[PDB]
């Protein structure tokens, strides 16, 4: 687990120990466990004397380990100007690539070594060489905020609009990393300000995504399009409002960016600031032009988007300005419906304080109380029933909130609806009562609550079917015994005369019979 003695001598620049070792063992290219020769160590630490000794004793100046890191690569990465010179005079190859296709110029430019980069360029290094991801040395210089390296590479006729495999120009990289000085040099040297990435992202889009305000001002000063869209229709205000960067949003709106723009999903910048919860960005959007009641796909408002995530103070902000809670989607869902689905009690309370109508019904026929009863939201149902909610509201199908609480097996909603007015004697379109559903689904505890509040076990459907008929047909012996102790008639027949024993015979449950 210790290094070979020649590596240790190379690290310490000990030429006497190295000379003794090479007199004993004449191999200067002894390999460590990682496969690095002592020349690699000498190039890393810029130990000139031991490097000259090793090269005079026959060390491979162009040694290539499995990862392809030559000593010239290490000297260029570390900034060892004198070692780079010495290796170049002894025959170091200038175009050799690593496993990720990095040249020594890539290593020099990534770490911003201007002198080394100029030395390699003067020896014929390829300035347009690419890595596995298509990064030229100017990309690596722009990524590291190496202003003078970018300047030197541009002076050596590097392509200012070279793209990576992701179609990223050096301006794109400068905008992504927030290096406004590199971006300034590139744009003053003629870089295109509206270059498109793979997803149609301009450098302005990336600057507005990462809250890089100085890059944004520098781009807009040099003729970047403020209304440029991506493939999805994203404006820089859509990106800034979604990410919540208030300085970017304020600067874009001050300069005259349109705030009522839409994308494929017909979403607006206020929609993305409601769906993300940035109340201050949305507040500034509404001070300027913004349609608070604007509609997207599926007829969704920013109130719909704010109610889904449950961010309460945005709901209060949107509602206080001009938002109308009674607006509904294509499926008929008002923001009260969405808030009741996710159990957002504070959002429901804020919506209800601003005249949200619980009488609004979806296409299926569901009030917000229905949705709470379907999804088991007992805090929302408690708050709705507290303030003007009809427990026996029904649509065309006749389903009440008690129907959908029993159907989805929400005991807490059932135990909350019954004392407040949820009637057990409410028939559906087919005449089914809430006790009909419990008896079929073997909800014994729900049935006990339904029976305790006056549920009738002999209530009949449109075809004469009682809950005892459904319990016996489904083979629920405990349900049948419960109903039979609450005045259920076991001899009662349906329209065709079928008794519960007939329905037991059809399916074959011995314990029920």
């Amino acid at each position: 687990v210790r290094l070979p003695a020649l590596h240790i001598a190379a690290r310490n620049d000990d030429t006497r120990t190295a000379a003794v070792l090479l007199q004993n063992d004449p191999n200067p290219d002894v390999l460590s466990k990682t496969g690095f020769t002592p020349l690699h160590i000498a190039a890393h630490y810029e130990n000139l004397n031991v490097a000259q000794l090793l090269l005079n004793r026959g060390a491979s100046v162009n040694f290539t380990p499995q990862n392809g890191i030559t000593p010239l690569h290490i000297a260029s990465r570390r900034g060892n100007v004198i070692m780079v010179r010495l290796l170049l005079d002894r025959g170091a190859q200038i175009e050799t690539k690593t496993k990720d296709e990095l040249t020594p110029l890539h290593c020099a430019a990534r770490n911003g070594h201007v002198r080394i980069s100029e030395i390699l360029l003067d020896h014929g290094a390829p300035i347009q060489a690419k890595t596995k991801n298509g990064l030229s040395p100017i990309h690596m210089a722009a990524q590291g905020d190496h202003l003078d390296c970018v300047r030197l590479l541009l002076q050596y006729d590097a392509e200012i609009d070279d793209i990576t495999l992701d179609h990223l120009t050096p301006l794109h990289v400068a905008a992504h990393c927030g290096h406004h000085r590199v971006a300034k040099v590139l744009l003053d040297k003629g870089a295109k300000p509206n270059s498109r990435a793979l997803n149609g992202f301009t450098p302005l889009h990336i600057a507005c995504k990462k809250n890089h305000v100085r890059v944004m001002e520098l781009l807009l000063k040099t003729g970047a399009s403020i209304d440029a869209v991506t493939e999805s229709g994203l404006t820089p205000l859509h990106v800034a409002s979604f990410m919540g960067h208030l300085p970017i949003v304020k600067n874009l709106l001050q300069r005259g960016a349109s705030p009522n723009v839409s994308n494929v999903k017909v979403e607006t910048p206020l929609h993305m600031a409601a769906r993300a919860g940035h109340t201050e960005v949305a507040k500034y959007l509404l001070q300027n032009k913004a349609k608070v009641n604007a509609k997207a796909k599926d007829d969704q408002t920013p109130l719909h988007c704010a109610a889904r995530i449950g961010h309460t103070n945005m709901v209060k902000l949107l509602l206080e300005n001009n938002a109308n809670p009674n607006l509904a989607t294509t499926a008929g869902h008002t923001p009260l419906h969405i808030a009741a689905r996710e159990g957002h009690v504070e959002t429901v309370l804020a919506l209800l304080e601003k005249e949200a109508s619980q009488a609004c019904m979806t296409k299926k026929g569901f009030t917000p109380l229905h949705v709470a009863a379907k999804y088991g939201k007992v805090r929302v149902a408690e708050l709705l029933l507290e303030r003007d909610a009809h427990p026996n509201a029904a649509g065309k199908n006749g389903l009440t909130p008690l129907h959908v609480a029993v159907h989805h097996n929400n005991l807490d909603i059932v135990k909350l609806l019954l004392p407040r007015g949820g009637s057990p004697h409410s028939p559906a379109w087919n005449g089914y009562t809430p006790l009909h559903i419990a008896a079929k689904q073997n909800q014994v505890e729900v049935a006990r609550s339904l029976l305790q509040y006056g549920g009738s076990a002999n209530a009949e459907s449109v075809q004469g079917v009682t809950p005892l008929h459904l319990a016996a047909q489904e083979g629920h012996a405990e349900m049948v015994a419960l109903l039979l102790s609450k005045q259920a008639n076991g001899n009662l027949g349906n329209k065709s005369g079928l008794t519960p024993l007939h329905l037991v015979a059809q399916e074959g449950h011995v314990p029920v019979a």
Binding site: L3, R11, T98, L102, L165, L168, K209, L234
Partner: peptide, 30 residues
């Protein structure tokens, strides 16, 4: 102290093999 660099693990850490690689090209898909 003053002798940790003589070992293969420490020298591998010192040589920083990750700086001779293309790390990634992040996009941060929104």
């Amino acid at each position: 102290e003053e002798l940790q660099d003589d070992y293969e693990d420490m020298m591998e850490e010192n040589l920083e093999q990750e700086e001779y690689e293309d790390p990634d090209i992040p996009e941060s898909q929104m």
